[PDB]
């Protein structure tokens, strides 16, 4: 049961570089590849993410793919960047230019044939594959263009596996790109059809949780990448450590996806305290499970107040008893009955591991399939229809192999998906 990791774009590359930090200090892997941990549990399931080479050096199953050569330098010279395999560093010469056309259609057609070879080399040397992991940004030209191209080219090759995408959804407050809506609606059309599970991250929700929950002074991108890495390493924790209950990466898919195109999730991470006020909190299961379902402890800008949950996951880590866990799930279902659908009797899925994160005592991870996510896609649709109506920035796309009707088809599937999310409420 092993996972092949992918990362496209500058934002996706930085998120993956911070995710491998958490993985490598969880398993006691040195920044050069040697082993320096204490417990035997770290070496048991090290083949999930890592590869064994001669000399006892451990290397990740990560393929480095983008368009812009200077983000090599932000990876190879990183804190834990020397463990990566240099032959998995593939990208082209010229930049993306924040175009979906340049990253998906014309320039990207000559890079996909070279990155699929490295993907085949890493995936075909395993004993039993389980799925793929991709970190990318939906608003760029590389993560949104070449990301969907790689998902399309991987789904045909391995149709009987599962897919993980950790997509940074555009935010209205953090507007760092003019052509944000065009890259937004050109990406999720090919993300709905083939990818079976997708964790949506919003930057403004991350800033809100770094301002109101952690009470941070100056939150940079490193803190948000650490939070999204804490979420990232908490959904596959049953694959790597024993526990009193099991949830591999397909049980989440079976429990949380009831209908084929309703698979967009709201990830969360519960045990977040204030900066210096850790002395005043009781680290108990009721306190964490009360904070977990709280509205401002999310990682997407959409409010769970305005909608109703379909399914809810909760992956616990630590040596906690099951009575308070399942009793508190029963409580949060019983007193929030208007916010869960009536046609599904039990709406939570629980799992318990036995290894907490480094630097804590007990932790959980919230994943939520809710109908409140339609508002985010709705505002993406308004930002798309404002720009596209007057043909605003179309000449950087239609000059590189595009039609008008592709954009209208993307918008059509956008309001179609919003209609399916709304119809079940």
């Amino acid at each position: 049961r092993e996972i092949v990791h992918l990362q496209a774009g500058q934002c996706g590359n930085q998120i993956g570089a911070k995710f491998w930090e958490v993985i490598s200090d969880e398993h006691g892997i040195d920044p050069t590849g040697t082993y320096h941990g204490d417990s035997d549990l770290q070496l048991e399931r090290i083949n999930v993410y890592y590869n064994e080479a001669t000399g006892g050096k451990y290397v990740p199953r990560a393929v480095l793919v983008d368009l812009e050569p200077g983000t090599m330098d932000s990876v190879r010279s990183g804190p834990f960047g020397q463990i990566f395999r240099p032959d998995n560093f593939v990208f082209g010469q010229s930049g993306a230019g924040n175009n979906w056309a340049k990253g998906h259609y014309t320039e990207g057609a000559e890079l996909v044939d070279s990155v699929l070879d490295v993907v085949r080399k890493e995936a075909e040397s395993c004993d039993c594959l389980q799925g793929f992991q991709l970190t990318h940004s939906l608003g760029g030209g590389t993560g949104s263009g070449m990301g969907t191209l790689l998902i399309s080219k991987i789904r045909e090759e391995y149709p009987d596996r599962i897919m993980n995408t950790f997509s940074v959804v555009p935010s209205p407050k953090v507007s760092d790109t003019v052509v944000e809506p065009y890259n937004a609606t050109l990406s999720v059309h090919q993300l709905v059809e083939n990818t079976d599970e997708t964790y949506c991250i919003d930057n403004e929700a991350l800033y809100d949780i770094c301002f109101r929950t952690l009470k941070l002074t100056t939150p940079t991108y490193g803190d948000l990448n650490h939070l999204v890495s804490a979420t990232m390493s908490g959904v596959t924790t049953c694959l790597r450590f024993p526990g009193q209950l099991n949830a591999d990466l397909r049980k989440l898919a079976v429990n949380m996806v009831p209908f084929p195109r309703l698979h967009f999730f709201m990830p969360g991470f519960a045990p977040l305290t204030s900066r210096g006020s850790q002395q005043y909190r009781a680290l108990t299961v009721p306190e964490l499970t009360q904070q977990m379902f709280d509205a401002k402890n999310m990682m997407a800008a959409c409010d769970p107040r305005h909608g109703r949950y379909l399914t809810v996951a909760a992956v616990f880590r630590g040596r906690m008893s099951m009575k308070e866990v399942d009793e508190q799930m029963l409580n949060v279902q019983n007193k929030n009955s208007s916010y869960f659908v009536e046609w599904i009797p039990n709406n939570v899925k629980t799992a318990v591991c036995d290894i907490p994160p480094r630097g804590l005592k007990m932790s959980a991870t919230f994943i939520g399939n809710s109908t409140a996510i339609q508002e985010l896609f709705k505002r993406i649709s308004e930002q798309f229809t404002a720009m596209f109506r007057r043909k605003a920035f179309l000449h950087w796309y239609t000059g590189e192999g595009m039609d008008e009707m592709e954009f209208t088809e993307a918008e059509s599937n956008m309001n179609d998906l919003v209609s399916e999310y709304q119809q079940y409420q």
């Binding site: 920044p31 050069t32 320096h36 200077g70 804190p79 024993p242």
Partner: protein
């Protein structure tokens, strides 16, 4: 795996090792990113110094520990063992806590 273990050149096998000495020619004008990576000759390794940010050069916290070797207080060695045992006590697992030996674990 502490400060005193961060000094001896054959350090005990619980401290992480520094990434190796590299010269750098950034891509950014050159056709290939050349890197002469020196591999230290076994016994002359180095205890790892800067896990805080980029190992390149720099760009508001502690990348190394704060207990500088100049000043005194590194004492109370009974005091520092307890957290080493307590982090170890978090990694014990349920089956080894209950079905190990002739019953549960005190």
């Amino acid at each position: 795996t502490g400060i005193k273990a961060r000094t001896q050149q054959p350090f005990p096998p619980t401290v992480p090792t520094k990434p190796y000495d590299t010269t750098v020619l950034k891509t950014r004008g050159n056709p290939y990113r050349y890197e002469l990576l020196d591999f230290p000759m076994d016994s002359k390794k180095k205890a790892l110094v800067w896990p805080g940010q980029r190992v390149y050069f720099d760009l508001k916290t502690f990348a190394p520990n704060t207990s500088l070797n100049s000043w005194d207080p590194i004492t109370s060695l009974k005091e520092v063992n307890i957290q080493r045992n307590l982090e170890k006590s978090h990694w014990i697992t349920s089956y080894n806590h209950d079905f190990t030996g002739l019953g549960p674990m005190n």
